[PDB]
């Protein structure tokens, strides 16, 4: 026996989507010294209406599970990967796995104006908090 239906609450009902586009997310593994693919889907920058606080959220296609859920603070910045383009690196305290994990993340975009748009909105939103 199973509940005939279960209403899903995304947890984003009191937030505004200020950025949303398809991307690829990577996570660095200190143990083996390699970047590992983490997810593929729409990476979203969310800002809460009331307290104006900002977070990044990302779910994976098809399985729809989280691969990113962490706050953005005014101190945080996006770095470029010297040899790669349309890619942004940053460090975050992520809770996608229901636990605090400090993670070095990279996001890859297909188009440059999407990457530039992601850097723009990232820097605006973090200061607007």
């Amino acid at each position: 026996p199973l509940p005939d239906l279960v209403e899903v609450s995304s947890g984003e009902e009191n937030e505004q989507v200020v950025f949303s586009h398809r991307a690829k997310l990577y996570r660095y593994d200190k143990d083996v010294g390699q970047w590992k693919e983490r997810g593929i889907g729409d990476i979203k920058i969310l800002q809460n209406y009331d307290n104006k606080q900002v977070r990044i959220v990302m779910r994976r296609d098809q399985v729809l599970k989280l691969c990113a859920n962490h706050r953005i603070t005014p101190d945080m910045t996006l770095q470029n990967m010297k040899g790669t383009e349309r890619v942004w690196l940053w460090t975050a305290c992520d809770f996608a796995d229901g636990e605090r994990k400090v993670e070095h993340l990279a996001v890859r975009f297909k188009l440059q104006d999407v990457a530039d748009s992601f850097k723009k909105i990232f820097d605006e939103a973090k200061t607007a908090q």
């Binding site: 279960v6 609450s9 947890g11 590992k36 983490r38 959220v57």
Partner: protein, 208 residues
Amino acid sequence: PQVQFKLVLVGDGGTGKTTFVKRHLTGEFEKKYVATLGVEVHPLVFHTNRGPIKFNVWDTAGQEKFGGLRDGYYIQAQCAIIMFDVTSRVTYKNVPNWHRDLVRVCENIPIVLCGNKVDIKDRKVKAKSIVRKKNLQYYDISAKSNYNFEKPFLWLARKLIGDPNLEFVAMPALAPPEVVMDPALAAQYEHDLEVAQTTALPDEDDDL
């Protein structure tokens, strides 16, 4: 009490059973073949419109010398996945043996047959030569391109629960805490990120 199901994963070596499970677990794509020894049990949770369901995946070894006690790992199994490599006909020729070994122990459990590596263009096993049991189901998949990589669990979930309209739903994203660190520890992670920035991304020269 949560709803669980024992799922046994069988197939020849290098077919992509462990790569498939790791993909579901962490979203990574393991490029190396590190042969599984005996069995490894990994829980997979999916959020459905009828609540979360957990799959306890028993990832079994495909090489006979590393098999351990395979037929014993099938005991009390509630579903199964058989995998092969569509670029290798031998891995498909052994599918009836894996199916035989499974049914000998678990009788009428729902089973999904997965033809993996369809991202590779030199395909030797065509889906027309597979396609018909009620408890059988076939999917082309690719652990590398993620093509159909959710369908085996979605179909098994629908059968086990008895609801053809069961859907996977978005995972709840609860508000994350803001973590504040002393400028010292922030610098230690800023240095670590610099070190990581020197290593390239794994798919840098893939199709993308």
